[PDB]
Amino acid sequence: GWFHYHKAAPKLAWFQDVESMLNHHLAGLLGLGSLSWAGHQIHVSLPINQFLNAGVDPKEIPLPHELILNRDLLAQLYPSFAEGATPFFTLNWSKYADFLTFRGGLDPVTGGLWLTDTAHHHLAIAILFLIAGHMYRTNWGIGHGLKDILEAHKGPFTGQGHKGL
Amino acid sequence: RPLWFASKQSLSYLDGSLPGDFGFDPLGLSDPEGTGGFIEPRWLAYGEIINGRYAMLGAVGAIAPEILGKAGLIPQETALPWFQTGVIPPAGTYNYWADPFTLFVFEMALMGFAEHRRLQDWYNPGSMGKQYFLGLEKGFAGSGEPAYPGGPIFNPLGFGKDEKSLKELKLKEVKNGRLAMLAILGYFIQGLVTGVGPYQNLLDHLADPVNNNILTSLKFH
Amino acid sequence: MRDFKTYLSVAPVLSTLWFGSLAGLLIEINRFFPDALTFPFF
Amino acid sequence: GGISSVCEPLPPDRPLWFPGSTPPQWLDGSLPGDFGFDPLGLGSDPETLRWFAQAELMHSRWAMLAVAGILIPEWLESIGLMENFNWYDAGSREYFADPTTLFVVQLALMGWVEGRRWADYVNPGCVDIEPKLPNRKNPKPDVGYPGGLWFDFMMWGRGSPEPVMVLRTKEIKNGRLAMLAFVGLCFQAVYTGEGPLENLSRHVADPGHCNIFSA
Amino acid sequence: EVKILVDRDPVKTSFEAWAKPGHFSRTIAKGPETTTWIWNLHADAHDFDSHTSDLEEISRKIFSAHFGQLSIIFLWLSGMYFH
Ligand code: CLA
Ligand code: CLA
Ligand code: CLA
Numbered sequence: 026g027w028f029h030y031h032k033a034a035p036k037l038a039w040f041q042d043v044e045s046m047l048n049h050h051l052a053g054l055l056g057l058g059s060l061s062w063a064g065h066q067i068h069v070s071l072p073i074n075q076f077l078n079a080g081v082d083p084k085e086i087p088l089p090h091e092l093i094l095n096r097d098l099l100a101q102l103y104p105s106f107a108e109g110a111t112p113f114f115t116l117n118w119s120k121y122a123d124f125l126t127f128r129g130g131l132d133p134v135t136g137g138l139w140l141t142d143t144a145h146h147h148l149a150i151a152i153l154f155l156i157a158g159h160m161y162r163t164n165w166g167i168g169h170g171l172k173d174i175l176e177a178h179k180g181p182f183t184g185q186g187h188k189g190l
Numbered sequence: 191r192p193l194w195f196a197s198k199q200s201l202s203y204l205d206g207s208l209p210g211d212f213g214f215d216p217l218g219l220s221d222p223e224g225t226g227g228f229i230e231p232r233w234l235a236y237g238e239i240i241n242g243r244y245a246m247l248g249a250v251g252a253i254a255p256e257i258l259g260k261a262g263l264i265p266q267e268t269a270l271p272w273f274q275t276g277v278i279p280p281a282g283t284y285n286y287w288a289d290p291f292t293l294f295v296f297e298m299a300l301m302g303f304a305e306h307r308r309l310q311d312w313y314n315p316g317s318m319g320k321q322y323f324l325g326l327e328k329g330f331a332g333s334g335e336p337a338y339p340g341g342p343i344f345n346p347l348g349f350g351k352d353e354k355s356l357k358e359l360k361l362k363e364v365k366n367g368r369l370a371m372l373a374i375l376g377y378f379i380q381g382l383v384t385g386v387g388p389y390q391n392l393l394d395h396l397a398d399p400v401n402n403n404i405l406t407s408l409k410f411h
Numbered sequence: 412m413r414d415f416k417t418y419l420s421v422a423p424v425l426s427t428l429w430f431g432s433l434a435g436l437l438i439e440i441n442r443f444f445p446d447a448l449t450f451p452f453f
Numbered sequence: 454g455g456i457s458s459v460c461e462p463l464p465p466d467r468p469l470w471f472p473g474s475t476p477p478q479w480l481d482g483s484l485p486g487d488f489g490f491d492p493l494g495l496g497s498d499p500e501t502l503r504w505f506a507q508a509e510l511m512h513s514r515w516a517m518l519a520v521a522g523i524l525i526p527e528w529l530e531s532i533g534l535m536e537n538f539n540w541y542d543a544g545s546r547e548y549f550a551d552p553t554t555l556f557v558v559q560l561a562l563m564g565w566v567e568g569r570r571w572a573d574y575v576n577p578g579c580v581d582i583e584p585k586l587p588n589r590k591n592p593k594p595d596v597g598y599p600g601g602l603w604f605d606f607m608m609w610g611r612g613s614p615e616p617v618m619v620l621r622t623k624e625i626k627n628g629r630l631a632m633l634a635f636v637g638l639c640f641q642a643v644y645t646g647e648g649p650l651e652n653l654s655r656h657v658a659d660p661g662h663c664n665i666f667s668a
Numbered sequence: 669e670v671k672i673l674v675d676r677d678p679v680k681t682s683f684e685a686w687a688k689p690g691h692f693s694r695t696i697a698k699g700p701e702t703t704t705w706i707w708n709l710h711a712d713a714h715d716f717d718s719h720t721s722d723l724e725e726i727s728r729k730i731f732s733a734h735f736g737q738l739s740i741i742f743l744w745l746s747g748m749y750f751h
């Protein structure tokens with residue numbers, strides 16, 4: 026905050042680049058954030074919470090980094106981790122049906138949503154936001170113009186429509 | 191002049207003066223309009239040169255102990271992959287003469303000297319020949335260009351006295367640097383995917399090409 | 412430094428320092444002489 | 454030609470704490486130990502600069518006395534000429550009086566002289582201690598650098614062997630080193646749980662270990 | 669055309685504006701004549717559209733105020749994690 030006002034302050038045209046701002050805030054802020062949180066839930070929250078709901082004492086639960094360095098430790102709870110990322114790259118996503126489930130309802134053990142459901146939800150949200158962030162035009166000719174999109178919508182009742190907004 | 195993925199905006203400022211210039215700037219990061227902070231084109235070229243030099247050191251330093259251990263030159267206990275030498279303690283740790291944090295403090299102090307001096311050359315050119323520093327400041331005057339200071343300390347053999355030789359050597363340096371940082375990124379990605387070291391990856395690719403590829407490594411380890 | 416001391420002399424900063432010192436003094440007095448309903452020294 | 458008793462300010466091209474940088478405009482080299490080190494701009498006001506210079510001088514002298522009184526008795530105990538010296542436990546020893554009454558007496562006695570020094574700083578020359586002999590002329594001393602018969606019985610200041618500025622920077626530099634040393638000793642006595650010279654002995658041997666990172 | 673357009677060192681970091689209350693506008697920097705001025709000083713503090721008519725300075729103040737708000741939020745989160 027001190028730097029971007031007292032030392033290196035953006036110009037007006039930097040702030041008025043709404044298309045690049047929307048692209049970065051839909052693909053880099055929401056999409057990448059949801060993807061990273063889905064990665065945390067898949068790699069950390071799911072095994073730790075499985076151990077907690079299994080009645081294992083919290084101090085005896087393996088540390089979250091131990092389930093990253095040891096893939097077999099995560100594979101005991103979810104066997105699909107033994108296959109690596111090849112089911113993702115071969116579009117055999119149904120192999121990931123042990124930690125990515127559309128179950129719904131609540132967990133009877135904890136009374137909350139299934140964490141696998143939240144992981145799949147955040148993954149799908151990340152995909153949707155990432156493909157929803159390549160919409161608006163920038164330095165390369167592909168993309169949409171917000172001004173043209175607004176000016177293209179005008180009806181008989183509204184006259185000139187959304188032009189000038 | 192050869193151009194690789196050149197742009198109309200990119201050619202407006204990349205005129206071939208800088209070494210290793212091929213017009214490649216799709217994002218326009220070196221645009222001289224609205225320039226400030228660390229986005230200055232001179233600072234960007236200087237950072238490219240420094241990163242290239244450090245990666246040319248690192249791409250050989252991260253693979254030499256493995257090759258020497260395979261060849262049996264110096265003891266195999268010191269011959270480890272680059273992540274097994276205490277850089278990443280979960281990946282592996284070696285018992286040196288000092289604690290890794292003590293070595294970090296020593297490195298931080300030495301490079302703080304050797305790099306804040308370079309930073310003050312960048313801020314004020316020729317400012318390190320004035321203040322007394324062990325009598326070595328006479329070799330720290332520089333030449334006005336921060337990336338290529340020269341002098342009896344940084345250019346002792348006097349390579350590239352001729353201007354065309356200097357330009358050719360600058361082009362060679364930037365090209366080998368770019369290749370080396372590509373190699374360092376490859377080292378990092380291969381460690382993330384395979385986790386056996388880059389020289390072991392090369393040996394596995396040489397032993398069989400089909401079974402050991404990027405395609406047959408997505409299972410990770 | 413003169414401008415910073417002038418800022419320290421403005422009303423909210425000086426009031427905050429004065430009232431914080433007063434509150435600390437009252438709190439320490441209430442710790443060392445707790446539950447005071449009368450003045451029994453005389 | 455003779456002995457100059459006035460401080461000579463350092464030239465503007467003096468060595469700095471951060472070579473290649475511009476020294477601040479309020480540090481012109483007229484103060485002892487002037488290396489242009491003021492990132493926060495605390496010495497912008499000249500009156501506060503004088504007060505901070507006097508405070509630095511006082512902290513320097515007290516820190517040098519403190520570190521001497523820590524190290525020399527500790528060096529004597531390690532040699533063996535002190536039976537049970539421990540500077541950390543020295544405050545909790547048994548003396549001829551309670552620490553509270555000793556503190557009150559020390560407060561009164563020291564607040565006499567600290568307050569005479571305050572009056573001298575506020576009004577230079579208001580308090581004079583050097584005798585006014587019938588034909589001896591007393592030179593006017595600088596504030597914070599007094600001394601005729603008592604404080605400067607050696608006449609090592611006032612331009613004698615090393616010029617006044619040189620000796621003043623020497624004093625200030627040794628004082629800064631002593632302040633850093635005393636703060637280090639205070640932290641080491643509660644971190645390492647040992648003495649200063651013992652810590653130095655275990656650091657000199659195998660310096661790769663026995664550090665801040667191994668308690 | 670979408671580049672990084674940034675000007676270097678537009679505002680000097682100093683405590684001179686700290687020593688003068690109500691520096692942002694003109695009718696308030698003249699000094700207090702009544703007590704109402706004090707309330708006005710806390711009413712137009714973040715009304716950047718009334719201080720200046722230039723959109724660039726307003727946008728820069730908005731950006732840095734957002735940064736300060738994010739710093740406060742991170743401080744609060746650190747406090748909750750510590751407690
Ligand atoms: C002024 C010089 C000074 C010197 C010579 C020493 C000397 C010593 N210290 Mg102390 N120390 C100092 C200041 C100093 N200290 C300060 C300012 C602090 C904290 C505020 C500490 C806190 C401290 C700790 C917590 C420990 C020591 C310990 C030790 C040993 C070094 C190993 C280490 O881990 O500590 C390095 C610790 C630091 C916090 C670095 C402080 C350095 C200051 C900021 C500057 C000194 C640099 C300067 C160039 C001095 C000149 C060197 C020489 C010419 C005198 C060594 C006997 C260790 C020990 O004895 O374990 C067995 C240890 O555990 N010191
Ligand atoms: C993909 C990268 C990216 C990201 C992550 C963001 C993210 C953000 N921007 Mg946006 N922005 C971008 C690109 C990006 N922006 C571009 C290209 C432009 C110019 C067209 C803008 C223009 C813009 C403006 C004008 C403003 C923002 C604001 C914000 C913040 C509001 C959301 C919020 O606070 O949630 C909370 C989010 C987080 C704390 C999660 C972590 C995000 C980290 C901390 C941010 C690092 C991102 C940064 C872009 C990259 C580093 C630069 C490098 C030199 C260090 C948020 C930190 C608003 C603000 O709050 O500013 C302070 C604001 O005023 N943005
Ligand atoms: C270290 C960073 C780096 C930097 C600062 C530069 C700097 C420069 N390049 Mg060089 N270059 C690099 C690497 C770099 N290059 C590499 C690796 C190659 C080979 C592919 C080249 C090949 C090259 C060509 C062919 C040309 C240039 C040119 C330019 C100039 C304009 C472009 C620009 O502004 O770059 C600024 C760049 C950045 C700030 C780098 C960071 C960008 C993001 C953060 C990268 C993230 C990628 C990374 C792989 C992902 C992270 C994963 C990791 C965690 C594992 C400028 C002098 C032009 C020229 O005129 O030369 C003088 C030109 O024509 N470069």
Ligand code: CLA
Pocket residue numbers: 514515517518597598599600601603604605609610611617620621623624627
């Ligand atoms: C650490 C080094 C040091 C240095 C270089 C200086 C330097 C300066 N001081 Mg400062 N001063 C110091 C420590 C120091 N001081 C301390 C600890 C105090 C508090 C007591 C003071 C308080 C002070 C006063 C009150 C005065 C000065 C003055 C001066 C000047 C005199 C020259 C000098 O002191 O001799 C340089 C050499 C030494 C300091 C050697 C160290 C002394 C050893 C350790 C012990 C002395 C030996 C022996 C026990 C004494 C004789 C015994 C006898 C009593 C029977 C010079 C500008 C005078 C002034 O500025 O007037 C113009 C002034 O009168 N100083």
